[PDB]
Amino acid sequence: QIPASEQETLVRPKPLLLKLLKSVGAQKDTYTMKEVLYYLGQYIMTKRLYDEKQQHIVHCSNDLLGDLFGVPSFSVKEHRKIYTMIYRNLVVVNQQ
Ligand SMILES: CCC[C@H]1N(C(=O)c2cnccc2C(F)(F)F)CCC[C@@]1(Oc1csc(C(F)(F)F)c1)C(=O)N1CCN(c2ccccc2OCCO)CC1
């Protein structure tokens, strides 16, 4: 019933975030929070959404990531903010 681990919470991304994750090789409909962070990472890296000079800043004002997170840019170091933005794009599910 209860996840391991917060990072092992099972989630079902909402349609647009699911679309985003599947665009970078994610084959699932249910993910752990760790997996969502991993695939978002694949997305940022393949689409080169980071600042070449300041790699901790993601620039996403003209990308689906920006539309879903609701920000033009954000710092990868601000975990609290990033979790808030991800949570709005998913639903928590049970381990069955
Ligand atoms: C450090 C090496 C791996 C990371 N990485 C880079 O930092 C990077 C490397 N070179 C150039 C530019 C970048 C980057 F733009 F992203 F900053 C490359 C992609 C994967 C990479 O970053 C991201 C994945 S999701 C993501 C976000 F929030 F923007 F959407 C960013 C990554 O896996 N982590 C691990 C997860 N972590 C994190 C973020 C938010 C909340 C909690 C978190 O961790 C808690 C433990 O799980 C961020 C770092």
UniProtKB/Swiss-Prot annotation:
Domain SWIB/MDM2: 9-92
Conditions for induction: By DNA damage.
Top-rank taxon, per record: Eukaryota
Tissue: Ubiquitous. Isoform Mdm2-A, isoform Mdm2-B, isoform Mdm2-C, isoform Mdm2-D, isoform Mdm2-E, isoform Mdm2-F and isoform Mdm2-G are observed in a range of cancers but absent in normal tissues.
Disulphide bond pairs: none
Family: Belongs to the MDM2/MDM4 family.
Disease: Seems to be amplified in certain tumors (including soft tissue sarcomas, osteosarcomas and gliomas). A higher frequency of splice variants lacking p53 binding domain sequences was found in late-stage and high-grade ovarian and bladder carcinomas. Four of the splice variants show loss of p53 binding.
Additional note from the record: MDM2 RING finger mutations that failed to ubiquitinate p53 in vitro did not target p53 for degradation when expressed in cells.
Stated name of the protein: E3 ubiquitin-protein ligase Mdm2
Gene label: MDM2
